[PDB]
Design a protein around this nucleic acid. Structure first.
Ligand SMILES: [Mg+2]
Ligand SMILES: [Mg+2]
Ligand SMILES: [Mg+2]
Ligand SMILES: [Mg+2]
Ligand SMILES: [Mg+2]
Ligand SMILES: [Mg+2]
Ligand SMILES: [Mg+2]
Ligand SMILES: [Mg+2]
Ligand SMILES: [Mg+2]
Ligand SMILES: [Mg+2]
Ligand SMILES: [Mg+2]
Ligand SMILES: [Mg+2]
Ligand SMILES: [Mg+2]
Ligand SMILES: [Mg+2]
Ligand SMILES: [Mg+2]
Ligand SMILES: [Mg+2]
Ligand SMILES: [Mg+2]
Ligand SMILES: [Mg+2]
Ligand SMILES: [Mg+2]
Ligand SMILES: [Mg+2]
Ligand SMILES: [Mg+2]
Ligand SMILES: [Mg+2]
Ligand SMILES: [Mg+2]
Ligand SMILES: [Mg+2]
Ligand SMILES: [Mg+2]
Ligand SMILES: [Mg+2]
Ligand SMILES: [Mg+2]
Ligand SMILES: [Mg+2]
Ligand SMILES: [Mg+2]
Ligand SMILES: [Mg+2]
Ligand SMILES: [Mg+2]
Ligand SMILES: [Mg+2]
Ligand SMILES: [Mg+2]
Ligand SMILES: [Mg+2]
Ligand SMILES: [Mg+2]
Ligand SMILES: [Mg+2]
Ligand SMILES: [Mg+2]
Ligand SMILES: [Mg+2]
Ligand SMILES: [Mg+2]
Ligand SMILES: [Mg+2]
Ligand SMILES: [Mg+2]
Ligand SMILES: [Mg+2]
Ligand SMILES: [Mg+2]
Ligand SMILES: [Mg+2]
Ligand SMILES: [Mg+2]
Ligand SMILES: [Mg+2]
Ligand SMILES: [Mg+2]
Ligand SMILES: [Mg+2]
Ligand SMILES: [Mg+2]
Ligand SMILES: [Mg+2]
Ligand SMILES: [Mg+2]
Ligand SMILES: [Mg+2]
Ligand SMILES: [Mg+2]
Ligand SMILES: [Mg+2]
Ligand SMILES: [Mg+2]
Ligand SMILES: [Mg+2]
Ligand SMILES: [Mg+2]
Ligand SMILES: [Mg+2]
Ligand SMILES: [Mg+2]
Ligand SMILES: [Mg+2]
Ligand SMILES: [Mg+2]
Ligand SMILES: [Mg+2]
Ligand SMILES: [Mg+2]
Ligand SMILES: [Mg+2]
Ligand SMILES: [Mg+2]
Ligand SMILES: [Mg+2]
Ligand SMILES: [Mg+2]
Ligand SMILES: [Mg+2]
Ligand SMILES: [Mg+2]
Ligand SMILES: [Mg+2]
Ligand SMILES: [Mg+2]
Ligand SMILES: [Mg+2]
Ligand SMILES: [Mg+2]
Ligand SMILES: [Mg+2]
Ligand SMILES: [Mg+2]
Ligand SMILES: [Mg+2]
Ligand SMILES: [Mg+2]
Ligand SMILES: [Mg+2]
Ligand SMILES: [Mg+2]
Ligand SMILES: [Mg+2]
Ligand SMILES: [Mg+2]
Ligand SMILES: [Mg+2]
Ligand SMILES: [Mg+2]
Ligand SMILES: [Mg+2]
Ligand SMILES: [Mg+2]
Ligand SMILES: [Mg+2]
Ligand SMILES: [Mg+2]
Ligand SMILES: [Mg+2]
Ligand SMILES: [Mg+2]
Ligand SMILES: [Mg+2]
Ligand SMILES: [Mg+2]
Ligand SMILES: [Mg+2]
Ligand SMILES: [Mg+2]
Ligand SMILES: [Mg+2]
Ligand SMILES: [Mg+2]
Ligand SMILES: [Mg+2]
Ligand SMILES: [Mg+2]
Ligand SMILES: [Mg+2]
Ligand SMILES: [Mg+2]
Ligand SMILES: [Mg+2]
Ligand SMILES: [Mg+2]
Ligand SMILES: [Mg+2]
Ligand SMILES: [Mg+2]
Ligand SMILES: [Mg+2]
Ligand SMILES: [Mg+2]
Ligand SMILES: [Mg+2]
Ligand SMILES: [Mg+2]
Ligand SMILES: [Mg+2]
Ligand SMILES: [Mg+2]
Ligand SMILES: [Mg+2]
Ligand SMILES: [Mg+2]
Ligand SMILES: [Mg+2]
Ligand SMILES: [Mg+2]
Ligand SMILES: [Mg+2]
Ligand SMILES: [Mg+2]
Ligand SMILES: [Mg+2]
Ligand SMILES: [Mg+2]
Ligand SMILES: [Mg+2]
Ligand SMILES: [Mg+2]
Ligand SMILES: [Mg+2]
Ligand SMILES: [Mg+2]
Ligand SMILES: [Mg+2]
Ligand SMILES: [Mg+2]
Ligand SMILES: [Mg+2]
Ligand SMILES: [Mg+2]
Ligand SMILES: [Mg+2]
Ligand SMILES: [Mg+2]
Ligand SMILES: [Mg+2]
Ligand SMILES: [Mg+2]
Ligand SMILES: [Mg+2]
Ligand SMILES: [Mg+2]
Ligand SMILES: [Mg+2]
Ligand SMILES: [Mg+2]
Ligand SMILES: [Mg+2]
Ligand SMILES: [Mg+2]
Ligand SMILES: [Mg+2]
Ligand SMILES: [Mg+2]
Ligand SMILES: [Mg+2]
Ligand SMILES: [Mg+2]
Ligand SMILES: [Mg+2]
Ligand SMILES: [Mg+2]
Ligand SMILES: [Mg+2]
Ligand SMILES: [Mg+2]
Ligand SMILES: [Mg+2]
Ligand SMILES: [Mg+2]
Ligand SMILES: [Mg+2]
Ligand SMILES: [Mg+2]
Ligand SMILES: [Mg+2]
Ligand SMILES: [Mg+2]
Ligand SMILES: [Mg+2]
Ligand SMILES: [Mg+2]
Ligand SMILES: [Mg+2]
Ligand SMILES: [Mg+2]
Ligand SMILES: [Mg+2]
Ligand SMILES: [Mg+2]
Ligand SMILES: [Mg+2]
Ligand SMILES: [Mg+2]
Ligand SMILES: [Mg+2]
Ligand SMILES: [Mg+2]
Ligand SMILES: [Mg+2]
Ligand SMILES: [Mg+2]
Ligand SMILES: [Mg+2]
Ligand SMILES: [Mg+2]
Ligand SMILES: [Mg+2]
Ligand SMILES: [Mg+2]
Ligand SMILES: [Mg+2]
Ligand SMILES: [Mg+2]
Ligand SMILES: [Mg+2]
Ligand SMILES: [Mg+2]
Ligand SMILES: [Mg+2]
Ligand SMILES: [Mg+2]
Ligand SMILES: [Mg+2]
Ligand SMILES: [Mg+2]
Ligand SMILES: [Mg+2]
Ligand SMILES: [Mg+2]
Ligand SMILES: [Mg+2]
Ligand SMILES: [Mg+2]
Ligand SMILES: [Mg+2]
Ligand SMILES: [Mg+2]
Ligand SMILES: [Mg+2]
Ligand SMILES: [Mg+2]
Ligand SMILES: [Mg+2]
Ligand SMILES: [Mg+2]
Ligand SMILES: [Mg+2]
Ligand SMILES: [Mg+2]
Ligand SMILES: [Mg+2]
Ligand SMILES: [Mg+2]
Ligand SMILES: [Mg+2]
Ligand SMILES: [Mg+2]
Ligand SMILES: [Mg+2]
Ligand SMILES: [Mg+2]
Ligand SMILES: [Mg+2]
Ligand SMILES: [Mg+2]
Ligand SMILES: [Mg+2]
Ligand SMILES: [Mg+2]
Ligand SMILES: [Mg+2]
Ligand SMILES: [Zn+2]
Ligand SMILES: [Zn+2]
Lengths: 37, 204, 122, 71, 59, 131, 5, 118
RNA sequence: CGAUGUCGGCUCGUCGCAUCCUGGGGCUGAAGAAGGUCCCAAGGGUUGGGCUGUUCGCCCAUUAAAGCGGCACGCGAGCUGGGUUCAGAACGUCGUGAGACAGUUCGGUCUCUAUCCGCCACGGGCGCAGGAGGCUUGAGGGGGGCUCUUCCUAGUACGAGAGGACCGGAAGGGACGCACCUCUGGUUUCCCAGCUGUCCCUCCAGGGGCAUAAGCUGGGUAGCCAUGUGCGGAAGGGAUAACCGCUGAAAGCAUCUAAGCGGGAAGCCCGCCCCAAGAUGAGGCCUCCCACGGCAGCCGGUAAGGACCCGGGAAGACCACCCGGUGGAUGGGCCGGGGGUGUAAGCGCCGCGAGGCGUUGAGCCGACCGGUCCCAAUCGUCCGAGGUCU
């Protein structure tokens, strides 16, 4: 899980979701998982 | 949850499977059920035990009436065992079998006014190298202007011991029922002749 | 009760005569070693042309203590010296002979070759 | 400067209340080689940091200029 | 030490509140059965010399 | 109650009376049941009784012997079940209840200070003449 | 008594 | 702590307290009754009773034992010939402490008499 | 600036979390093992040494780890005083000089008494609408909270091999904490013995004083103790963090989420141990006494009870607490046992003698376990309800 202030899509299969008040990027590539923080 | 009142007899050690077993001997039996606390009447469950018969010439009228409602001879000590409802009207050492684990509560030995070293295992001060009249002193007790005070609960000199202490999970080495003797492995709070309480362990 | 600074005689033929304990190899911060414990030690006195020499930092197991060891049977045993046998990192002795009696506690603690070589186990 | 560690601390010797409470002394450590240079030549940490880094560089230079010579 | 010292004069109210414990208690006295004189219990009567029903000392 | 009697009553099941009387200064052989890995064997520990501290059933005694060039002191409970038997090997005559001072004595020095206790040696020889 | 020098 | 310690100190070192009990013993065996402070009187009972009981035994050994404290052969002679016979059938309790009513003026000390029992 | 004592150490902590370790995770260029990196997590833990006044740093040997910071760079009415920071002296250096120096060197007075707050202990008072003796609930506090190694699973899964698991299960430690004194080991101010010099008793013998506030020496009960012994950290229930899901739209797909549901930390709540109804919100139960006499008040005499006084106590500074007070085993004595010391004196025998042998495990003998009214806790005195209103 990448934890950073700038979360973006990294590849075309990335998905930006907002769950539980936080921005996440989820993806079939597990490297691309991001949490904003 | 079973329990009984008793007196610390003294220590010795026995041999069992070619091992010295330090034991404390307790005289626990017998304890007559004097009152049972019930949820209906008292809001909780407990058995008020008696222990040691007392010279009825020394038992005032409020207490005599209390024993009378139980049909029980006057007794020196009344203690409740909490959450215990024995079947009979008497509790004896038989409630314990060798191999069980018990909790023992007693009144520790009283150190009186105790120094910071005896009471709290403080290091004290040096004994040479110029140490000036502080060899057993506690050192600093605070900071400076912030917070400008001393915490509650600060470890200081004061009275030590003669307080309720419970030592836990002691092995019942033997039960000699004809003498109302319980043998427990290890050490038990307080002096010989002290009152103790023997409950089933809460350790699992 | 062996601790840093403590001197021990050497009950083997490695050539070391006196080692000085510098560590009790027993967890984070053991205060003392007794029989069967291992120490790290400096070699303070040795006979010429031995296995180990003065100044070496070595490992050894304690085999005798002047502080009496107590036993589950209720007995105890006490020696006139503090003595140790120099070992390697596999716990085996580095000399071929063990001088003097050793505590039977060593058997219980896997120092069998030492127990083997000692002329008396007590 | 990423392979360099700079320690600051109180200096030794005279100064009164100043030298007691001031982090004027500096050590610079070349982390790969381990060689250090210290400086409390002045009263100022910044001047001692500057002078210490100079001497450290000059010394690592002579070390580099000397292995080059031995080759 | 550094010679601690009262920071303020103690008020008349405070010093007298300190002394709220200083009143003497009167001495415990029982009548001597022999001569009826008041004297401390468990002491030989200093008036008639009696204790425990008999004479113990001259007076 | 009588707390002393209760403790003596607890202890009485573990008390022995088969062992011979001895005194500090006597040479004694304790045959001691010792477990070794798996089995148990009897190991003889023979030496001078340098101390008997008494406390009823809790009496213990200390025996000293020079073993392969090293002094060894073993401390024995007098009522331990691990003791097979104690044989009196010799009666020595001492002047004090505790013989700590023999740790710093030479061989002849102990020989001189703890001499054969003829009286109790004759008492031992007169007994065993009860056939 | 030491000094604030 | 002083737990289960027997024996009063009376703010005297070991030899002063020993000499104190000896001298109070001499005065008591001499006059039969002496006044002293309450704590001293209580401690004196056992010191003197022991010397009287040994006198009741009467052997030479006891006499020399009593002599170590009393030092006075006349007083010991009075102890064995006059004092001790009075107590042949008495099993201890040879001394009596009763407390006085009025304190010492100059220091407030509570006083008591110590006497040999009849 | 009519003074806010300045470094380091010591002592005692306490807090933060940007986490050194231990617990939980995601990613990995994660095969396993071991690491990297980031996230959650402050409950606990965070060693001993060499050098230097050192802080700092380096080094040695270990460790799960050897965290970083705040608290007047925490803490000198708590200690230290090596450094700094006066007066002496000296070196280098500067100055004609007197002298001078974040240059060096050796030396150099750190103040018995705590009033108020605060803190640790402990009482006194009143209150808790009758007066009392017990026994209690637990609001609310506090304590505690660490971790390692080996073994089995299994030399298995994984790996070419070297190496080597998860999960689960046993065993053994280190440090710390509480209590304890059976054992081990201390102390043991007079419990025993031995020894010198001197003076004395009483000449011998036997003893006493003094040589320390034990003359010295060898021992040493109880107690108080650690180095010794027992036991503790949990288990378990609940709710969570990061993180992982189930079902699922908005948004035909997808989505841990917007409705709802799971799983999930040494942390959080409970659980454990201790305090605790001044919890003035002053609680509950069992028992006892009871409508007394005189103009929600007063005045006495009483009740059940209590206090005073006394004998004491592994309780204790005083106070308090606890037991006992002649219907008594509470202290003291006496007796028996334990325990210590280690064979008393006197006598007889052997020796020229110093001595030795026997009587003899004798004599002495604190406190420990008991017995016994021999001595003392005599005799008493004073308090102390009559119960507001709806
Ligand atoms: Mg970017
Ligand atoms: Mg997706
Ligand atoms: Mg108790
Ligand atoms: Mg209790
Ligand atoms: Mg107590
Ligand atoms: Mg204790
Ligand atoms: Mg102290
Ligand atoms: Mg301590
Ligand atoms: Mg303590
Ligand atoms: Mg210390
Ligand atoms: Mg110390
Ligand atoms: Mg000192
Ligand atoms: Mg000083
Ligand atoms: Mg001071
Ligand atoms: Mg001093
Ligand atoms: Mg202090
Ligand atoms: Mg201040
Ligand atoms: Mg300060
Ligand atoms: Mg403040
Ligand atoms: Mg108390
Ligand atoms: Mg406790
Ligand atoms: Mg267990
Ligand atoms: Mg059994
Ligand atoms: Mg019985
Ligand atoms: Mg050797
Ligand atoms: Mg050798
Ligand atoms: Mg050398
Ligand atoms: Mg060399
Ligand atoms: Mg070897
Ligand atoms: Mg940096
Ligand atoms: Mg500085
Ligand atoms: Mg310096
Ligand atoms: Mg200057
Ligand atoms: Mg100077
Ligand atoms: Mg500054
Ligand atoms: Mg001071
Ligand atoms: Mg001061
Ligand atoms: Mg001072
Ligand atoms: Mg002052
Ligand atoms: Mg003022
Ligand atoms: Mg004032
Ligand atoms: Mg004023
Ligand atoms: Mg006024
Ligand atoms: Mg005034
Ligand atoms: Mg006041
Ligand atoms: Mg006034
Ligand atoms: Mg006052
Ligand atoms: Mg008054
Ligand atoms: Mg006992
Ligand atoms: Mg020999
Ligand atoms: Mg001889
Ligand atoms: Mg003989
Ligand atoms: Mg004390
Ligand atoms: Mg006390
Ligand atoms: Mg003291
Ligand atoms: Mg006593
Ligand atoms: Mg005395
Ligand atoms: Mg005094
Ligand atoms: Mg005095
Ligand atoms: Mg005085
Ligand atoms: Mg005086
Ligand atoms: Mg003296
Ligand atoms: Mg006289
Ligand atoms: Mg007269
Ligand atoms: Mg007088
Ligand atoms: Mg006097
Ligand atoms: Mg006596
Ligand atoms: Mg005669
Ligand atoms: Mg009286
Ligand atoms: Mg006067
Ligand atoms: Mg006066
Ligand atoms: Mg009086
Ligand atoms: Mg100023
Ligand atoms: Mg002023
Ligand atoms: Mg001012
Ligand atoms: Mg001022
Ligand atoms: Mg801190
Ligand atoms: Mg964080
Ligand atoms: Mg972690
Ligand atoms: Mg982890
Ligand atoms: Mg892995
Ligand atoms: Mg790999
Ligand atoms: Mg990771
Ligand atoms: Mg992350
Ligand atoms: Mg933490
Ligand atoms: Mg370190
Ligand atoms: Mg050195
Ligand atoms: Mg150092
Ligand atoms: Mg340093
Ligand atoms: Mg430095
Ligand atoms: Mg490491
Ligand atoms: Mg690790
Ligand atoms: Mg500071
Ligand atoms: Mg600091
Ligand atoms: Mg400070
Ligand atoms: Mg100071
Ligand atoms: Mg300071
Ligand atoms: Mg201050
Ligand atoms: Mg100050
Ligand atoms: Mg202060
Ligand atoms: Mg101040
Ligand atoms: Mg200085
Ligand atoms: Mg100085
Ligand atoms: Mg000046
Ligand atoms: Mg010059
Ligand atoms: Mg000029
Ligand atoms: Mg010039
Ligand atoms: Mg010049
Ligand atoms: Mg200059
Ligand atoms: Mg200068
Ligand atoms: Mg400078
Ligand atoms: Mg200098
Ligand atoms: Mg110089
Ligand atoms: Mg200087
Ligand atoms: Mg000097
Ligand atoms: Mg002073
Ligand atoms: Mg005050
Ligand atoms: Mg104030
Ligand atoms: Mg206050
Ligand atoms: Mg109160
Ligand atoms: Mg009510
Ligand atoms: Mg009421
Ligand atoms: Mg009550
Ligand atoms: Mg009561
Ligand atoms: Mg409760
Ligand atoms: Mg609570
Ligand atoms: Mg409150
Ligand atoms: Mg809590
Ligand atoms: Mg924990
Ligand atoms: Mg395997
Ligand atoms: Mg498998
Ligand atoms: Mg392998
Ligand atoms: Mg496992
Ligand atoms: Mg802790
Ligand atoms: Mg403790
Ligand atoms: Mg204890
Ligand atoms: Mg004992
Ligand atoms: Mg002991
Ligand atoms: Mg011992
Ligand atoms: Mg004596
Ligand atoms: Mg003499
Ligand atoms: Mg003579
Ligand atoms: Mg004289
Ligand atoms: Mg003198
Ligand atoms: Mg001297
Ligand atoms: Mg003497
Ligand atoms: Mg001694
Ligand atoms: Mg000793
Ligand atoms: Mg003792
Ligand atoms: Mg002892
Ligand atoms: Mg003891
Ligand atoms: Mg203790
Ligand atoms: Mg310990
Ligand atoms: Mg443990
Ligand atoms: Mg745990
Ligand atoms: Mg859950
Ligand atoms: Mg769908
Ligand atoms: Mg889905
Ligand atoms: Mg939802
Ligand atoms: Mg959930
Ligand atoms: Mg799941
Ligand atoms: Mg409670
Ligand atoms: Mg209440
Ligand atoms: Mg309560
Ligand atoms: Mg109110
Ligand atoms: Mg109300
Ligand atoms: Mg409230
Ligand atoms: Mg109310
Ligand atoms: Mg109430
Ligand atoms: Mg309730
Ligand atoms: Mg009361
Ligand atoms: Mg008292
Ligand atoms: Mg009191
Ligand atoms: Mg008073
Ligand atoms: Mg008192
Ligand atoms: Mg009073
Ligand atoms: Mg009473
Ligand atoms: Mg009465
Ligand atoms: Mg009695
Ligand atoms: Mg008695
Ligand atoms: Mg007494
Ligand atoms: Mg005996
Ligand atoms: Mg004996
Ligand atoms: Mg003889
Ligand atoms: Mg004789
Ligand atoms: Mg003779
Ligand atoms: Mg003779
Ligand atoms: Mg002759
Ligand atoms: Mg002889
Ligand atoms: Mg004896
Ligand atoms: Mg005597
Ligand atoms: Mg006697
Ligand atoms: Mg006796
Ligand atoms: Mg005992
Ligand atoms: Mg009777
Ligand atoms: Mg009366
Ligand atoms: Zn992607
Ligand atoms: Zn009268």
């Amino acid at each position: 899980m990448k934890v950073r202030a700038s979360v973006k899509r990294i590849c075309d299969k990335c998905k930006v979701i907002r769950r539980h008040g936080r921005v996440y990027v989820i993806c079939e590539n597990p490297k691309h998982k991001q949490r904003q923080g | 949850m079973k329990g009984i009142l008793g007196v610390k007899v003294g220590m010795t050690r026995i041999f069992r499977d070619d091992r010295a077993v330090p034991v404390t001997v307790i005289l626990a039996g017998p304890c007559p059920v004097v009152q049972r606390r019930t949820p209906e009447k008292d809001g909780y469950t407990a058995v008020q035990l008696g222990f040691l018969p007392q010279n009825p010439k020394r038992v005032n009228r409020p207490l005599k009436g209390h024993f009378a409602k139980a049909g029980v001879e006057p007794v020196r000590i009344l203690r409740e065992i909490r959450d215990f409802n024995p079947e009979g009207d008497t509790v004896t050492v038989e409630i314990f079998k060798p191999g069980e684990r018990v909790d023992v509560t007693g009144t520790s030995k009283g150190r009186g006014f105790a120094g910071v070293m005896k009471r709290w295992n403080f290091a004290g001060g040096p004994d040479s190298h110029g140490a000036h009249k502080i060899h057993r002193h506690p050192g600093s007790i605070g900071n400076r202007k912030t917070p400008g005070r001393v915490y509650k609960g600060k470890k200081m000199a004061g009275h030590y011991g003669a307080e309720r202490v419970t030592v836990m999970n002691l092995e019942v080495v033997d039960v000699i029922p004809e003498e109302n003797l319980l043998l427990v492995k290890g050490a038990v709070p307080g002096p010989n002749g002290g009152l103790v309480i023997v409950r089933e362990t809460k350790k699992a | 009760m062996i601790q840093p600074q403590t001197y021990l005689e050497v009950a083997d033929n490695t050539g070391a005569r006196k080692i000085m304990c510098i560590r009790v190899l027993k967890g984070s911060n053991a205060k003392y070693a007794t029989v069967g414990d291992v120490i790290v030690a400096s070699v303070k006195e040795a006979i010429p042309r031995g296995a180990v020499k003065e100044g070496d930092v070595v490992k050894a197991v304690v085999v005798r203590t002047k502080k009496e060891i107590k036993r589950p049977d209720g007995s105890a045993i006490r020696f006139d010296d503090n003595a140790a046998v120099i070992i390697n990192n596999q716990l085996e002795p580095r000399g071929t002979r063990v001088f003097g009696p050793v505590a039977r506690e060593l058997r219980e603690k896997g120092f069998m070759k030492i127990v083997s070589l000692a002329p008396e186990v007590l | 400067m990423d392979e360099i560690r700079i320690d600051v601390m109180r200096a030794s010797g005279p100064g009164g209340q100043g030298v007691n409470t001031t982090d004027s002394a500096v050590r610079v450590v070349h982390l790969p080689t381990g060689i250090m240079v210290t400086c409390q030549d002045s009263r100022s940490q910044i001047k001692n940091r500057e002078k210490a880094l100079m001497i450290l560089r000059s010394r690592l230079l002579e070390m580099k200029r000397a292995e080059e010579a031995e080759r | 030490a550094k010679h601690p010292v009262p920071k303020k004069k103690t008020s008349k109210a405070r010093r007298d509140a300190r002394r709220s414990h200083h009143a003497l208690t009167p001495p415990t006295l029982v009548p001597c059965p022999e001569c009826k004189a008041m004297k401390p219990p468990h002491t030989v009567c200093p008036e008639c010399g009696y204790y425990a029903g008999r004479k113990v000392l001259e007076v | 109650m009588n707390r002393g009697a209760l403790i003596k009553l607890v202890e009485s099941r573990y008390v022995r009376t088969d062992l011979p009387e001895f005194r500090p200064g006597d040479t004694v052989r304790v045959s001691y049941k010792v477990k070794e890995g798996n089995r148990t064997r009897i190991q003889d520990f023979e030496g001078i009784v340098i101390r008997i501290r008494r406390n009823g059933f809790n009496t213990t005694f200390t025996v000293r012997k020079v073993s392969y060039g090293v002094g060894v002191e073993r401390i024995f409970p007098l009522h331990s079940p691990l003791i097979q038997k104690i044989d009196i090997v010799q009666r020595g005559r001492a002047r004090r209840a505790k013989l700590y001072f023999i740790r710093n004595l030479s061989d002849r020095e102990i020989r001189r200070k703890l001499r054969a206790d003829r009286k109790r040696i004759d008492q031992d020889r007169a007994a065993e003449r009860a056939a | 008594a030491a000094a604030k020098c | 702590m002083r737990h289960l310690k027997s024996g009063r100190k009376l703010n005297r070192h070991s030899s002063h307290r020993l000499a104190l009990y000896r001298n109070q013993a001499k005065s008591l065996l001499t006059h039969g009754r002496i006044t002293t402070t309450v704590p001293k009187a209580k401690e004196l009972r056992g010191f003197v009773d022991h010397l009287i009981h040994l006198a009741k035994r009467g052997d030479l050994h006891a006499r020399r034992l009593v002599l170590r404290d009393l030092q006075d052969v006349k007083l010991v002679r009075k102890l064995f010939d006059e004092i001790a016979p009075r107590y042949r059938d008495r099993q201890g309790g040879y001394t009596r402490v009763l407390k006085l009513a009025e304190r010492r003026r100059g220091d407030g000390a509570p006083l008591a008499l110590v006497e040999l029992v009849e």
